[PDB]
Swiss-Prot record, chain A:
GO BP terms: cytoplasmic translation; maturation of LSU-rRNA; maturation of LSU-rRNA from tricistronic rRNA transcript (SSU-rRNA, 5.8S rRNA, LSU-rRNA); ribosomal large subunit biogenesis
Protein name: Large ribosomal subunit protein uL30A
Top-level taxonomic group: Eukaryota
InterPro entries: Ribo_uL30_ferredoxin-like_sf, Ribosomal_uL30, Ribosomal_uL30_CS, Ribosomal_uL30_euk, Ribosomal_uL30_euk_arc, Ribosomal_uL30_ferredoxin-like, Ribosomal_uL30_N_euk
Subunit structure as annotated in this protein's UniProt entry: Component of the large ribosomal subunit (LSU). Mature yeast ribosomes consist of a small (40S) and a large (60S) subunit. The 40S small subunit contains 1 molecule of ribosomal RNA (18S rRNA) and 33 different proteins (encoded by 57 genes). The large 60S subunit contains 3 rRNA molecules (25S, 5.8S and 5S rRNA) and 46 different proteins (encoded by 81 genes).
Family named by the database record: Belongs to the universal ribosomal protein uL30 family.
Protein location: Cytoplasm
Keywords, in A-Z order: Cytoplasm, Ribonucleoprotein, Ribosomal protein
Gene expressing this chain: RPL7A
Note in the entry: Present with 101000 molecules/cell in log phase SD medium. There are 2 genes for uL30 in yeast.
Segment forming the signal sequence: none
From Swiss-Prot, chain B:
Upper lineage: Eukaryota, Fungi, Dikarya, Ascomycota, Saccharomycotina
Residue ranges the record marks as coiled coil: none
Subcellular location: Cytoplasm
Included range, full protein: 108 to 160 of 160
The name this protein goes by in its record: Large ribosomal subunit protein eL21A
Subunit-level organization: Component of the large ribosomal subunit (LSU). Mature yeast ribosomes consist of a small (40S) and a large (60S) subunit. The 40S small subunit contains 1 molecule of ribosomal RNA (18S rRNA) and 33 different proteins (encoded by 57 genes). The large 60S subunit contains 3 rRNA molecules (25S, 5.8S and 5S rRNA) and 46 different proteins (encoded by 81 genes).
Organism: Saccharomyces cerevisiae (strain ATCC 204508 / S288c) (Baker's yeast)
Role: Component of the ribosome, a large ribonucleoprotein complex responsible for the synthesis of proteins in the cell. The small ribosomal subunit (SSU) binds messenger RNAs (mRNAs) and translates the encoded message by selecting cognate aminoacyl-transfer RNA (tRNA) molecules. The large subunit (LSU) contains the ribosomal catalytic site termed the peptidyl transferase center (PTC), which catalyzes the formation of peptide bonds, thereby polymerizing the amino acids delivered by tRNAs into a polypeptide chain.
Additional remarks: There are 2 genes for eL21 in yeast.
Family membership: Belongs to the eukaryotic ribosomal protein eL21 family.
From Swiss-Prot, chain C:
One Pfam family here: Ribosomal_L6e
Protein name: Large ribosomal subunit protein eL6B
Keyword hit for Heme: no
Annotated organism of origin: Saccharomyces cerevisiae (strain ATCC 204508 / S288c)
Similarity comment text for this entry: Belongs to the eukaryotic ribosomal protein eL6 family.
Record's subcellular location: Cytoplasm
Positions bearing Phosphoserine: 11
Complex formation: Component of the large ribosomal subunit (LSU). Mature yeast ribosomes consist of a small (40S) and a large (60S) subunit. The 40S small subunit contains 1 molecule of ribosomal RNA (18S rRNA) and 33 different proteins (encoded by 57 genes). The large 60S subunit contains 3 rRNA molecules (25S, 5.8S and 5S rRNA) and 46 different proteins (encoded by 81 genes).
UniProt keyword list: Cytoplasm, Isopeptide bond, Phosphoprotein, Ribonucleoprotein, Ribosomal protein, Ubl conjugation
GO cellular component: cytosol; cytosolic large ribosomal subunit
Note: Present with 38400 molecules/cell in log phase SD medium. There are 2 genes for eL6 in yeast.
UniProt xrefs under Gene3D superfamilies: 2.30.30.30
Swiss-Prot record, chain D:
Species name: Saccharomyces cerevisiae (strain ATCC 204508 / S288c)
Name assigned to this protein: Large ribosomal subunit protein uL15
Gene: RPL28
Record-listed cross-link Glycyl lysine isopeptide (Lys-Gly) (interchain with G-Cter in ubiquitin), residues: 95
Keyword Disulfide bond: no
Main location per the UniProt record: cytoplasm
Motif (Nuclear localization signal): 6-12, 23-29
GO biological process, one term: cytoplasmic translation
RNA sequence: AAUUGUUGAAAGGGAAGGGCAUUUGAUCAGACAU
RNA sequence: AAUACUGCCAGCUGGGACUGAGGACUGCGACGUAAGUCAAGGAUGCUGGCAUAAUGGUUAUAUGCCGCCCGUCUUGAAACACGGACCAAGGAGUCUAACGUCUAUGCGAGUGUUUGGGUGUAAAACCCAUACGCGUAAUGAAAGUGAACGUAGGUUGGGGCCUCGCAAGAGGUGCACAAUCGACCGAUCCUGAUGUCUUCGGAUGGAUUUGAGUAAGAGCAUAGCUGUUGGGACCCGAAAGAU
RNA sequence: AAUAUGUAAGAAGUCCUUGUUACUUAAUUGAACGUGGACAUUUGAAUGAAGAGCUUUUAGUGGGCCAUUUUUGGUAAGCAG
RNA sequence: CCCUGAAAAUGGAUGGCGCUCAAGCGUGUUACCUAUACUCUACCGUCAGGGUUGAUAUGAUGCCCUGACGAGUAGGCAGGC
């Protein structure tokens, strides 16, 4: 196979075109995020100016991290944790928010800390602790080629494609989140901010729906 | 429901559109604006304890 | 036979190491090590003595001098981490430093077979020292107590807080 | 052998693979077949359902020689003809020269009718023949001639 | 710790390489391992996996079974593949010419096949004749008909062939088998 | 062989995300939003400051 | 081997023994010498 | 207007600690028109001292912290529960008859030489006739009867193969196996043909009946682990009974 | 009431036509099983599936104890159930 | 909150010392300490998925790549001394 130059040129051209497509898609996604957040802010401002209240839409996804160990767990919460793939003590998973998943979270309330992650939290999670599920093996999300090989069926071509399908619950969110391996997060740097974790966050504890406060905890635990 | 999905699927195929035949769990409610025209909020506070016995 | 020969002898050649990627960029020196700064030696033969920083040598070392007429520290090189950079700067433009490089302090190595080292200075080195120190002494003299200061040797006194002591 | 036995693997283990609570005692459930109508009843009714009791009349001084009657089916009926003559007789299907098969001399008593046979005549000599075996042989074109 | 949802370190449970010191069988296993590695033909995988089966798992396929398989429409000229032993059947009389490939052939079965006009082939010759198993028909002997199987799963109202040593009127057909004596199974 | 973090390694960051270069060039992380001045309604302000 | 004598070393405020880690004393291999 | 608070930056930058796994290139990518360079699929560069008990190992000791006596019965043992003063040697799931599952092997509708004969370099090895044992036929108490309507059947799912197709898939063939509906053999209950030692024969056709059956054989023999039974039966142990 | 609990959420299905029958209906009426034809990527809610299904054989065990909650006998018990 | 109610036998126990705008009680916010837990890395082993015919320093039971996992009496099996 003395002909290597043609193969190199073809591969380089294909990679250049793929990188250009990924760049244009990421630019479109950045424009979309800016447009959505600025539209939400301006809608709030306009309602307040007109004399009303703008009730934001309920968040579409949650991030759920186990907080409890593995010993002495009742069967129903244990099974729900297994179904949410929070096997280890500090594993984490994104979950679409519907009635069924809300009931799931209510069943596993005393063993998880969950909220709605921001784009910053989601992006940092995918970049640092993003791992795939190729051939039942947990491969790291090192290059966009790995993501294109498996999720090219659904149009998820890049890691930012994956982040987009995660942040905006989309047509293939189930497939994207299933492809993402359960994140193994470290303990929160600087502690949990609480003397005792095993009370609901409302009760001055750590578990339960922390909602918007989940970002700080997840960033510390990353 | 089986024949209902049959009817919707036939109609969607005739009109060349997606079927979306699956049910969906209760989705989170979308964003909406609540007016105050004749609905000024009423301030509510706890009630002090008074025995009825 | 006392021990049966193994079926498989491992390969005998030495495999070359892979192409490492550790290209050397020149060392960045902290801003306090401006040439012409009065430093203090914290380790070595001349520990505690104050010297003048002249040139950053080709390798990561600092060429320093007493100047030798005061406190008897000759032209040496030291390491940045082993000196403390005071704020008593002295002008250095009056001396020539291009001659002194890494090869200038070349040690004539003696093999380990000698073992008879139980019992002199280069004349070139003594003349360079006498010219550099005589060129630096005039710069030193322009300020009141710098010569006596360089003759003195640094030493922590009781109650000193190196975390709060300015330099 | 004795080196592959699990006893060698059990050296160093206190109970030697026989448990700590219910140690290997002499005979906890009685000797062999003890308590068939008793504590072993569940096993003896689950795996040997028709054991206890008696069925049928007796036969004093029964001799198996009288009952000697090995059975032979038609598919195997062509085996008693020697191998080399087999194709010669199969090819030459003739009522004039159909082969004689002495099943008794071979060692069989009864000829039964399982399977088919090629459509060639054959004189079969048999102590006993089933109805269907005789029907099949006669349909093929031979004759079942009884002997003794 | 891990909330283990599956039994850890459990073996796949399937035989890999035969549990036999037959050097020639090992050679065939090596050959078809290479073929299954570097060929996308599922025939290679299935024959490699069948090379491992035990004796009770490799029932002897009869030449009568061979003929019945060849009787199938569109499979008259196919090469029959048998990972096992082919046995002579003195019940059939007309046998069709074919190329039968198997590990071991009984003397009678080999004689029958060569007399019919076809030729007997060993699995290495099969590999050199059809690397991807083209025009091949895999046969298999009957598994459920061995003597030991009839006793399996015995219980009441199952009728699974009691393990009685000596069969007779007295043995294992008294009370518990007929309604007059006790009950019925 | 090794897992290099995109966040703390600019090289692998640019590998994973081609948009990172133009993002840094345009300083989109500290974008200056346009200043639009609208005032909340007196009803809202009174309801906020109400007992 | 249990057990005992002498010599030598060491420790020892109502047990001795042990694990992790090092100071101290005694003792010791390998490698540059290629 | 600022600031506090919260949040973001694919903003910059300083100090510290641990790690250096891999070993020709391959891949992704960045800077450069380019050559090439690079922090880009895991450490390199420069320098110093020692080159021997210096590092390290072993051992004794000190110090800091931890450390209950082992085996056994037990829900629970350090137990104020039992055995153990110490040491050397001996010391406890073996063998056999019959076997169950699984596995290896030889032959395979056959299989098993070794009861015996022949032979022998002599308890070895080699050869062999006739039978018998098991299997190729089951069922019934027994008399007895005794397994193809058919391409050894129909339906469903089937690995694999074949045909078409770039593939997705479609069609054909579909062994093994699984479910089911039938056919046949036997038994039980029925129906009772030709006929006739006129009381014998049981043709044909049925049954929410059942049998350890047939439905193009799968067994025999040897060896092995495990398990079962009788044997002293894993080792040691009675009060007793008899001659 | 709460907690627990059964079933279903399709391909072994649905729709159209017409076949078999000794069952059934006054009647091809109906019942069961069928021939042929039609369906899509959402093939009939969510989540997860670490492979799914199946077989043989066999060990030890068959003295239990405690904690939250419900609860019986008892005044109660480191009581008994 | 404190005091009386408040009596048991060897000397004695917020663990001890001891503590009084506490080192007590109630509450709030930070900082900090450390498990064989969590995160990353190395190594050992196991399991699983794979690559490798090229003559072969041979041996395909060999070499190599990827991922996850590792507690345990009775007991089972395997590899070994």
């Amino acid at each position: 196979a003395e002909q290597v130059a043609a193969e190199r040129a073809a591969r380089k051209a294909a990679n250049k075109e793929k990188r250009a497509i990924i760049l244009e898609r990421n630019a479109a996604y950045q424009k979309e995020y800016e447009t959505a957040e600025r539209n939400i802010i301006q809608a709030k401002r306009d309602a307040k100016a007109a004399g009303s209240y703008y009730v934001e839409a309920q968040h579409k996804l949650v991030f759920v991290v186990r907080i409890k160990g593995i010993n002495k767990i009742p069967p129903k919460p244990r099974k729900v944790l297994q179904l949410l793939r929070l096997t280890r003590i500090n594993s984490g998973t994104f979950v679409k928010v519907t009635k069924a998943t809300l009931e799931l979270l209510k069943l596993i309330e005393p063993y998880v800390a969950y909220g709605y992650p921001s784009y910053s939290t989601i992006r940092q999670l995918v970049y640092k602790r993003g791992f795939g599920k190729i051939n039942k093996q947990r491969v790291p999300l090192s290059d966009n080629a790995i993501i294109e090989a498996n999720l090219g069926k659904y149009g998820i071509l890049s890691i930012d494609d994956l982040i987009h399908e995660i942040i905006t619950v989309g047509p293939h969110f189930k497939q994207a989140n299933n492809f993402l391996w359960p994140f193994k997060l470290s303990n929160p740097s600087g502690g949990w901010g609480v003397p005792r974790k095993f009370k609901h966050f409302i009760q001055g504890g750590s578990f339960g729906n922390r909602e918007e406060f989940i970002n700080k905890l997840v960033k510390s635990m990353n | 429901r089986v024949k209902a999905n049959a009817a919707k699927r036939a109609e969607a195929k005739a009109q060349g559109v997606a079927v979306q035949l699956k049910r969906q769990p209760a989705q989170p409610r979308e964003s909406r604006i609540v007016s105050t025209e004749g609905n000024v909020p009423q301030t509510l506070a706890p009630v002090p304890y008074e025995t009825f016995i | 036979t006392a021990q049966q020969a193994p079926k498989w002898y491992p390969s005998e050649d030495v495999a070359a190491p892979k192409k490492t990627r550790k290209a050397v960029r020149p060392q960045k020196l902290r801003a306090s090590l401006v040439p012409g700064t009065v430093l203090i030696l914290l380790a070595g033969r001349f520990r505690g003595k104050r010297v003048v920083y002249l040139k950053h040598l080709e390798d990561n070392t600092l060429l320093v001098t007493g100047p030798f007429k005061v406190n008897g520290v000759p032209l040496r090189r030291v390491n940045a981490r082993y000196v403390i950079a005071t704020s008593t700067k002295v002008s250095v433009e009056g001396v020539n430093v291009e001659k002194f490089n890494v090869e200038y302090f070349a040690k004539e190595k003696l093999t380990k077979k000698e073992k008879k080292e139980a019992k002199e200075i280069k004349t070139e080195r003594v003349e360079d020292q006498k010219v550099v120190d005589k060129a630096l002494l005039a710069e030193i003299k322009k300020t009141p107590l710098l010569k006596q200061y360089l003759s003195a040797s640094f030493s922590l006194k009781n109650g000193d807080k190196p975390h709060l002591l300015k330099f | 052998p004795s080196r592959f036995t699990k006893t060698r693997k059990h050296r160093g283990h206190v109970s030697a693979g026989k448990g700590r609570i219910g140690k290997h005692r002499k005979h906890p459930g009685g000797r062999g077949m003890a308590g068939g109508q008793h504590h072993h009843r569940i096993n003896m009714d689950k795996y040997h359902p028709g054991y206890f009791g008696k069925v049928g009349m007796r036969y004093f001084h029964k001799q198996q020689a009288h009952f000697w009657k090995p059975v032979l089916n038609l598919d195997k009926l062509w085996t008693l003809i020697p191998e080399d003559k087999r194709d010669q007789y199969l090819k030459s299907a003739s009522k004039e020269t159909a082969p004689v098969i002495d099943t008794l001399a071979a060692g069989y008593g009864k000829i039964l009718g399982k399977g088919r046979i090629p459509n060639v005549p054959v004189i079969v000599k048999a102590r006993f023949v089933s109805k269907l075996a005789e029907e099949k042989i006669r349909a093929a074109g031979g004759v079942v001639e009884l002997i003794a | 710790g891990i909330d283990h949802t599956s039994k850890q370190h459990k073996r796949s449970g399937h035989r890999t390489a035969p549990k036999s010191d037959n050097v020639y069988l090992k050679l065939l296993v090596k050959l078809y391992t290479f073929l299954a590695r570097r060929t996308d033909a599922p025939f290679n995988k299935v024959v490699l996996k069948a090379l491992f089966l035990s004796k009770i798992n490799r029932p002897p396929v009869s030449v009568s079974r061979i003929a019945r398989a060849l009787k199938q429409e569109g499979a008259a000229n196919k090469t029959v593949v048998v990972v096992g032993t082919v046995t002579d059947d003195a019940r059939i009389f007309e046998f069709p010419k074919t190329t039968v490939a198997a590990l071991r052939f009984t003397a009678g079965a080999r004689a029958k096949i060569v007399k019919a006009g076809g030729e007997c082939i060993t699995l290495d010759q099969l590999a050199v004749r059809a690397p991807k198993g083209q025009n091949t028909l895999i046969l298999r002997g009957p598994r459920n008909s061995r003597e030991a199987v009839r006793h399996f799963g015995m219980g009441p109202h199952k009728g699974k062939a009691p393990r009685i040593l000596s069969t007779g009127r007295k043995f294992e057909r008294a009370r518990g088998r007929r309604r007059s004596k006790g009950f019925k199974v | 062989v090794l897992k290099k973090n995109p966040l703390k390694n600019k090289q692998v960051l640019l590998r994973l995300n081609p948009y990172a270069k133009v993002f840094a060039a345009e300083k989109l992380g500290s974008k200056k939003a346009e200043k639009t001045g609208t005032k909340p309604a007196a009803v809202f302000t009174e309801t906020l400051k109400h007992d």
